[PDB]
Amino acid sequence: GSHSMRYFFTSVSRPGRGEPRFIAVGYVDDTQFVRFDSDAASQRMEPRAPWIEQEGPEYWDGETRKVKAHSQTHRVDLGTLRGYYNQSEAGSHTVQRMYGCDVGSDWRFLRGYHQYAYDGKDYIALKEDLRSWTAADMAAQTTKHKWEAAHVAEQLRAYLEGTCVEWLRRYLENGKETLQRTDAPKTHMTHHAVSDHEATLRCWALSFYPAEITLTWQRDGEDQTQDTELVETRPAGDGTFQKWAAVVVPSGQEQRYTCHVQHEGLPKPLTLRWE
Amino acid sequence: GVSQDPRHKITKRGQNVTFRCDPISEHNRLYWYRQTLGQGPEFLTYFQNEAQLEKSRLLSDRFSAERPKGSFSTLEIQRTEQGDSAMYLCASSLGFGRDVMRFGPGTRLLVLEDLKNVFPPEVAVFEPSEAEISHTQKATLVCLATGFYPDHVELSWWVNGKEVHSGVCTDPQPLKEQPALNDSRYALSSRLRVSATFWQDPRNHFRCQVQFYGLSENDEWTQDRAKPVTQIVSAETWGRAD
Amino acid sequence: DAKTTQPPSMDCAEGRAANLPCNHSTVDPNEYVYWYRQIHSQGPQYIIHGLKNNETNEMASLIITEDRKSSTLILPHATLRDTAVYYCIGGGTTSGTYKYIFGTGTRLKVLANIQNPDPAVYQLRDSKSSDKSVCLFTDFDSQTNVSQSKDSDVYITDKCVLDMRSMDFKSNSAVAWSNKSDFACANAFNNS
């Protein structure tokens, strides 16, 4: 299958109660492998997956120096944005950047990312082209010229096409036991009687990786989105994920309903019906 | 527009010194490097805004670099040793994109055990050869600055009370009067060549000028000879047709 | 870790192209390479960047090999002012290091082209006061060499090109002097 590396960056201003809180995490697929917290004691990039602890001290000195420059950079960014939008130093604000890699099943480069958000809305993003920007506001339009003048794309493209791709493959080789695995969902289902006259049918899926999964409820082999409940896919905490879909049904008509599961680890989609 | 002061500095061994750098504004990154005669610059420190993120594992402890307002940067050397003597370069970069590092003009630090070795230049000027005018119909003047330490000098020719650049070549770097001696005095030469007609015109004035950067006005001086402070020293000629 | 290699010295004829090579032996391909120039007691002056494709500007041009393991800075019609030390450096930015490692660099000495070689030594009497004297060795071609004398009393400066721009005439020169009544200008440059 295909794979991805993404670094996510979050800086939030807390004016008058300290300097901005900055958090930088790194993922490969749905497995996190690095952390940095500006408020944390260590002031170093820390391993959060066992396969990356392999990396020498030069890796951590370097990645810590880079992530510190990001903390420093985003601190300025909140200040710059406040100025761009003519807003007051009183209010709290949040800054968000994402960049990363995609590779296909052939481990050849697929696409590159560099996206940015101010308090939850798209600010600026680099296009699929890796050579040009999409500015939302006039604010982002000024950021756009600043980056075109500097020639940001030049090596940012080289990083996402090159170094980012090169190192994602090295991570997939080193952590192949955790990254390249495919844990198929452990499906069951439960029946709770809300009363006489009604009943709930919950469709389980547990201990699966990666997180991508589909649960759908059919009434007599026909899709029903009416009176369903879909919970957000949730992490178990041990590198696996859980998801369930429920439907409230008339009592007696239990075996009229079927739950459709789709996962990459499942050779073809399992269907579930009440015993 | 990367600025540094002072351009030169003599200090006594054991004394403390501080250099300032005012980087290009809009530049997030600031670097310190140092340079000894005939070697490439050697990295000392790197700033991202206010934050010192990389020290040079080799050069530090007695050295202290700050950049409090993420703008101007100071570098302090407590208890100077003779081995601190070098050109200290500031540099700034935008911090992203081609992130091109622009150098400053440098602080030339020289640390001495004793300021008794500091001298300003003796300057002389030499009149063109009779033979040389007959042979080529050209006249070469020769300037010599001798017996100055350190080698912080700038030489220029002034014709009729205006600085000139056409017709002059100065030695690329000063030469040591005793190349083997520990802390040898320095010498420097310069040639101003003009048409034979312009030399023999006795209306014309020729002056050689060597700016020398010596002790500050606030340096302790207790020797018999004059205090070798910052000064310009000159030597004059008038044209001769005979 | 991110180092370059260049030849120590190189001579080029004025007006022809100066081709200064650099090997990016250990520089990551996705890191910028930079070129700087420097003369005695001055801060290094920037020239040109390099990443993948070749570059050019008013100062010079840089042509990058396919492998990006070697580059060539090119000064098209080398003026006398282009004489300097040239530094090719490469980023180590991909690791967490924002240093750059300068080597010795190539000292380019561009030689002025002498139309009418006319080697001669002269003697110049001191002005203002005193009977002191210095020897001038002028008008020789850029092939000629000078040396430091056996005697510790005698000083010989390095060669130096002159340019009187109002006559398109350029000439070499080299001075000598010493402390003694016993010293002739004949024997100042004759042991060369």
């Binding site: 960056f9 880079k66 992530v67 600026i124 | - | -």
Partner: peptide
């Protein structure tokens, strides 16, 4: 590895 020159807005 992270990108080392996160550009300032």
């Amino acid at each position: 590895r992270m990108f080392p020159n996160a550009p300032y807005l």
